[PDB]
Amino acid sequence: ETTALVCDNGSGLVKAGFAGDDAPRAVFPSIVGRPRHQGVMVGMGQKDSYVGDEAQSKRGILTLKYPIEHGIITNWDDMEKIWHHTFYNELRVAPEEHPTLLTEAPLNPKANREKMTQIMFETFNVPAMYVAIQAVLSLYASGRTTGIVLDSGDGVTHNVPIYEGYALPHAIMRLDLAGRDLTDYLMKILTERGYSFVTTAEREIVRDIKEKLCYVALDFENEMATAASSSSLEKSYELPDGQVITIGNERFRCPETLFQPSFIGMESAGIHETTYNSIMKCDIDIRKDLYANNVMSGGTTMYPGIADRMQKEITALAPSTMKIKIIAPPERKYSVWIGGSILASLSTFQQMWITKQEYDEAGPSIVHRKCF
Amino acid sequence: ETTALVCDNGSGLVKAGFAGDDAPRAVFPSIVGRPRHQGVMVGMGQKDSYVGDEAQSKRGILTLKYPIEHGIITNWDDMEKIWHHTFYNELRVAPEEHPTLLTEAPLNPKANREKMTQIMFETFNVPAMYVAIQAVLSLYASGRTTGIVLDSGDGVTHNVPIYEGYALPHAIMRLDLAGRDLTDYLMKILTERGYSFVTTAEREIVRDIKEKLCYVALDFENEMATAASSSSLEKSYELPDGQVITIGNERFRCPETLFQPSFIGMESAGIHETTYNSIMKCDIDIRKDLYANNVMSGGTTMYPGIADRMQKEITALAPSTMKIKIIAPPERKYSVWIGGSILASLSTFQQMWITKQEYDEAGPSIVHRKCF
Amino acid sequence: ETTALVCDNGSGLVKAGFAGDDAPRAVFPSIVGRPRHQGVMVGMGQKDSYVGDEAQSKRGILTLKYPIEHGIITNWDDMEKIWHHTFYNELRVAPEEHPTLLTEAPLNPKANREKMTQIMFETFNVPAMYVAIQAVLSLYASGRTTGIVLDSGDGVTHNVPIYEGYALPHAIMRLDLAGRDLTDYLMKILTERGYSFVTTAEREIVRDIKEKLCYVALDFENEMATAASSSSLEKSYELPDGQVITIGNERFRCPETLFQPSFIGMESAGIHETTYNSIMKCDIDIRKDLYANNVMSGGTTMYPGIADRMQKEITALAPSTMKIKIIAPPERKYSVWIGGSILASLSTFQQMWITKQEYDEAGPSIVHRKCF
Ligand SMILES: Nc1ncnc2c1ncn2[C@@H]1O[C@H](COP(=O)(O)OP(=O)(O)O)[C@@H](O)[C@H]1O
């Protein structure tokens, strides 16, 4: 009778909804706002803290804080506020009679998982729980049982190879370079044109202009020479005060940090070299099927032109005798949640739930034994 | 009315079919695979054991085990699994209404015979059964009655001389030097060029390299001087991860272990000297017929140039006044099956099966007094 | 009258000195460091590259490269620079009038060895050289002529059995599991407690943590049981910035990859099983001396409790009437150089030196015919 809830807790955006549906019921950015100015008006509905889209609407008078930093929950009171808002105010449901599925990045610290188990079996008193890896849900939504998944959120960019439903845990790659670092790099490179962006509302504006006006170059050097010589690549954006800015070559230097991490000073390899070493760390028999199935998910793969540059770099790195095809569906930023709608819908999954009873006589540590 | 099943149960491959047919139907290698990595995707028939060619298909995520090791059935549960697969899936017949002939190497322990008798009669409940020697079935398939048969499968190299149907049990020779050892030696010498192969999955790849690219040199020192002087003997192979390897003298260094077994530390004689010591251990007058009828059989005699080398070595070893002929049919790797199709079809053979009643009155020991 | 040099050029560290001495003079890790930021200060004695301890001290602004990867020399200009540094700058020795001795792990590919000849003769112009197997030098430093040597360096872990000075080439076992893989696995499991290490500069910090605080558990399951049920096993470590970390069960899980290599995903067996198969692949008589003369060498055998654990595992594997002794001297880290100094200063040794003239007619391929 009961229908399970699915809550994709990413790093910047939270997607919560019911199992079996095609699209998430509530998508809103996971932020907590607090007022940085004194209040002169008596009344006004002056809440001590703002959450969700309400904080995003009046961000000019709010200091905004992200409770998730690099896929790791730092502030927990903000997270119980986020989960209370998405349970009671958004979905308008009671958690006492609903199973609940969570998404977590691999190679995460363990105490995050026991505190996640602790802070919702005791407070919201759910009758079931499960925590799953995001890339497994990406293959569930993709409808195939084989491939290597590049998932890049706001904080974590991880590569997971899975062959015939059997994941290889030694081949799991994790990088801390994602869209927040791209936002910070876009803050850094806009100072040459003279536009100053320092505050968190300005960080939201930099995230919006990164969402609307960025793309990946197929080749960096020739398009840099084209932007230096010609005057066709620039575009205009309208700031919400009324000012208009013009951006030339910065709209393709920003995602290039994904392929060249030395721009922000990170020593580690690019995302193409990370994917190629993740394929190279796997066994020799399964690499042929892994070259033919490259699955993407997350909003950071929403830059136009990521697939062609990705295919060119993997085709350069791999030997030429292999065919390389990249699956990039246009609904992939909501991909992982749809896998949750695959996962709770199955009757085979219905006995591996962590109910209240095994949580009582084992403590939080049961989430290590059951989940993953 | 009932058709007898012929199941040549070799070390590497198994060949199952009906008696009277000219070729076996179910030919598949004798491996059992078990999962090695963590299973994450719920459902879709994740089996705990794969046997036969599907284990070859999924070998990148499976640890592989050979139940027969040099003609010794070690793990009997896997052997029962592969007999269940070759009865019920491949041939897809009821084993309780068909007689079953089985093959074995000579100088093999009696508990192997007793346990094959026990598993045939108690588990599958066959109505009749018989066990025969591989070299005798090779001489049946050769279509002659006098000769010395050298059969070298994947795990065993045996040599049996027969004159006018009367075998000579004192002159039967056995040697644990076959295709498994040749594969391991080729795995050892491939590291000199920098190619590394360690796992059991890529042992099949090294076996395929040995099948496709090796050959027997007529003169070893001249071929070594030719490989050292020039590069015409080099050949390339495509691994299934796209990497292209190339090998020079390693094509003919690997089968030379059959003629020079001191390369892997065994102080025993070569297979030509094994035949020469076999032919002098026979009686004084039957040697002339045995020299002209060197029947060759087995899968590891399919190398190019092995017959001319064997001709030169026996012609050097024997006194020069006789003809030495080596019978090498092009279908010789199935010959152990083919005479097994010959032997079960004879009307003079139908009285010497082991029935159910004889097993019930005499225990498993009936196969010692009846079979050979 | 001239003295020989002994330069153990292992995969992690270089240990160089004169023959006849009891201890090496120049011990430094095989590191080539290159700058990765921009240089803004004019002058300051800035160099294009760094080597040795000078690379180690300035590692915060450097990208570090190992030229040797699992025994195989990959980058040759870096290793030429390391040989130039250890000859001219460390030892203060002009190498045109001193012979040198070099070490190499067995089952290495041949193409290193001639190049290990070639730039030794064409660049530095040494009068003679010799290349030796490391386990032979370990048995020289042990002062006995009979035993099996487990040598585990930074890249290669190999077993070599030698009885009465006669090595058995077919029983030599190689396994690519050593201190770099242990460092990478420790770097993987340290993310469970929330400690992140991604750059190659802080890989040396993880190596120092592995050197100081790790130990081999005698029995694994009760050690995990008492690690979960108490906190006496936890130890604290000081990072050089000032931060303090605390490690618990990670102290003994990281040596356990030596005995349970399925943690990092390779299908192969542990070092005790590899030693046991190396003993059983030898001849039937000599095992009486091989069980009682286990010899350990290399820096990877420096963990506390490895000898008692290996004694318990070998005593489990061997039959109970066999006496098993493991020889673990406290100077076994430096034993390869000590045996090289013993061999180089030995009286009958000075006829198997590969001289300049013999290289001049024979080409680089003299090293296969003369050395080993
Ligand atoms: N249309 C778009 N184009 C480029 N980037 C986008 C787009 N939409 C979202 N993003 C980026 O994706 C990141 C978050 O995406 P997503 O993975 O869906 O959320 P989360 O990281 O919270 O799971 C944001 O930092 C944003 O910069």
Ligand SMILES: Nc1ncnc2c1ncn2[C@@H]1O[C@H](COP(=O)(O)OP(=O)(O)O)[C@@H](O)[C@H]1O
């Ligand atoms: N064309 C070939 N070239 C070289 N070796 C071959 C060839 N075909 C088969 N073999 C070898 O024959 C061995 C097994 O052959 P066979 O005797 O038919 O199977 P079994 O030993 O199981 O009875 C294998 O190990 C394989 O290496």
Ligand SMILES: Nc1ncnc2c1ncn2[C@@H]1O[C@H](COP(=O)(O)OP(=O)(O)O)[C@@H](O)[C@H]1O
């Ligand atoms: N005290 C110690 N405890 C544990 N491991 C050590 C210790 N000292 C060195 N090691 C390990 O030994 C490895 C290399 O040691 P060594 O064999 O001396 O150098 P090489 O492998 O270059 O010959 C290093 O990777 C290091 O992790």
Ligand SMILES: [Ca+2]
């Ligand atoms: Ca996400």
Ligand SMILES: [Ca+2]
């Ligand atoms: Ca055979």
Ligand SMILES: [Ca+2]
């Ligand atoms: Ca060493």
